[PDB]
Amino acid sequence: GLMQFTLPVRLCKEIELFHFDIGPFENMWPGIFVYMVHRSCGTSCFELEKLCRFIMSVKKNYRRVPYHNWKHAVTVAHCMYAILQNNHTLFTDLERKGLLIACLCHDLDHRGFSNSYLQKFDHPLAALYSTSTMEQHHFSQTVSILQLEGHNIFSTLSSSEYEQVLEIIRKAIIATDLALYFGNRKQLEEMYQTGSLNLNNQSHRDRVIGLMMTACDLCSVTKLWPVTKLTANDIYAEFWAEGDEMKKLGIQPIPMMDRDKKDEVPQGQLGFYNAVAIPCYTTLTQILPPTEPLLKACRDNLSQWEKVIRGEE
Ligand SMILES: CS(=O)(=O)c1cccc(-n2ccc(=O)c(-c3ccnn3-c3cccc4c3OC(F)(F)O4)n2)c1
Numbered sequence: 001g002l003m004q005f006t007l008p009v010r011l012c013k014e015i016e017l018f019h020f021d022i023g024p025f026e027n028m029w030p031g032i033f034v035y036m037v038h039r040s041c042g043t044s045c046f047e048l049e050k051l052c053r054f055i056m057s058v059k060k061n062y063r064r065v066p067y068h069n070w071k072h073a074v075t076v077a078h079c080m081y082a083i084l085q086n087n088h089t090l091f092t093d094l095e096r097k098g099l100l101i102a103c104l105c106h107d108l109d110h111r112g113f114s115n116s117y118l119q120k121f122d123h124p125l126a127a128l129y130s131t132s133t134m135e136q137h138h139f140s141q142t143v144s145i146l147q148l149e150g151h152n153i154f155s156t157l158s159s160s161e162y163e164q165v166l167e168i169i170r171k172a173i174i175a176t177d178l179a180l181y182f183g184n185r186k187q188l189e190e191m192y193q194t195g196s197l198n199l200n201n202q203s204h205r206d207r208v209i210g211l212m213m214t215a216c217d218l219c220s221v222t223k224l225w226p227v228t229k230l231t232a233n234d235i236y237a238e239f240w241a242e243g244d245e246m247k248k249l250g251i252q253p254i255p256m257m258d259r260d261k262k263d264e265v266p267q268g269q270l271g272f273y274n275a276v277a278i279p280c281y282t283t284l285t286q287i288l289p290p291t292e293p294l295l296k297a298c299r300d301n302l303s304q305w306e307k308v309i310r311g312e313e
């Protein structure tokens with residue numbers, strides 16, 4: 001009960017900021033997550049023995065791929081920690097419990113390939129889940145791990161509180177399917193503009209948690225330039241491997257995934273910042289004013305990619 005996790009001074013202070021990088025020491029990431037759970041939820045919401053076993057099983061079920069890995073899991077959980085900690089009063093007890101777990105689990109057993117490649121490969125997962133293919137898989141792996149002996153971190157919830165938190169986690173993980181982000185942000189934009197946005201409407205909360213999930217998932221574009229630039233290498237290493245596998249199926253991949261079109265990456269980044277990232281953090285800042293630092297950091301990185309194009313780096 002009285003066993004508080006504590007971080008060294010620089011991490012204790014910088015973990016509270018949106019642009020925090022969890023560092024290269026793999027063995028510190030479990031402790032960084034528990035620290036975050038304890039401060040954003042309480043020391044009481046999870047049994048430490050159960051939580052520690054859950055985290056290490058989640059870790060084991062992330063693969064050794066360049067980007068969609070255990071470090072991405074904990075990074076996305078940290079962005080969610082920063083949002084919850086900057087919006088203390090807006091979220092229920094179950095939401096704070098569900099969302100950090102949802103983030104940690106959101107890419108469980110990711111192979112480094114898009115839903116599109118699974119569909120063109122004719123992977124069994126594409127027959128089992130026709131849309132949001134990997135995202136339904138990620139949720140399935142979350143439930144599987146929750147059901148390992150000694151792993152039910154929610155076992156002290158009632159039947160209905162339990163069904164409510166698994167429902168928060170399912171929607172939250174499904175929302176990380178970027179195909180669903182565009183329509184979701186459009187609706188939130190319209191609801192915000194016409195003043196119909198109502199956080200007491202459960203269907204509106206769902207939408208707002210969806211956009212938070214997109215924002216946490218994309219959060220590599222909200223880091224300091226050196227973190228963002230170096231993460232871009234891991235992201236594109238997966239895209240190019242997928243491009244290679246597309247060519248193996250006799251399909252010319254989109255330029256984003258062609259390692260022969262490596263020259264077009266800077267302009268591809270501008271497109272993504274303008275089409276996806278900036279719109280995402282703008283709508284999020286409108287709904288949750290204190291998440292503005294994510295928008296500001298995003299804009300700073302868009303400017304850094306413009307500088308790359310102009311040969312200024
Ligand atoms: C062709 S499209 O629809 O425009 C399209 C689709 C998917 C990613 C991208 N794309 C391009 C360039 C990029 O730097 C990123 C990026 C930045 C941060 N994270 N990710 C990202 C990477 C890999 C997978 C992901 C990603 O976020 C996700 F959670 F959405 O799933 N993403 C673009």
Ligand SMILES: [Cl-]
Pocket residue numbers: 039085088
């Ligand atoms: Cl607090």
Ligand SMILES: [Mg+2]
Pocket residue numbers: 106107134176177
């Ligand atoms: Mg994903």
Ligand SMILES: [Zn+2]
Pocket residue numbers: 072076106107176217
């Ligand atoms: Zn992700």
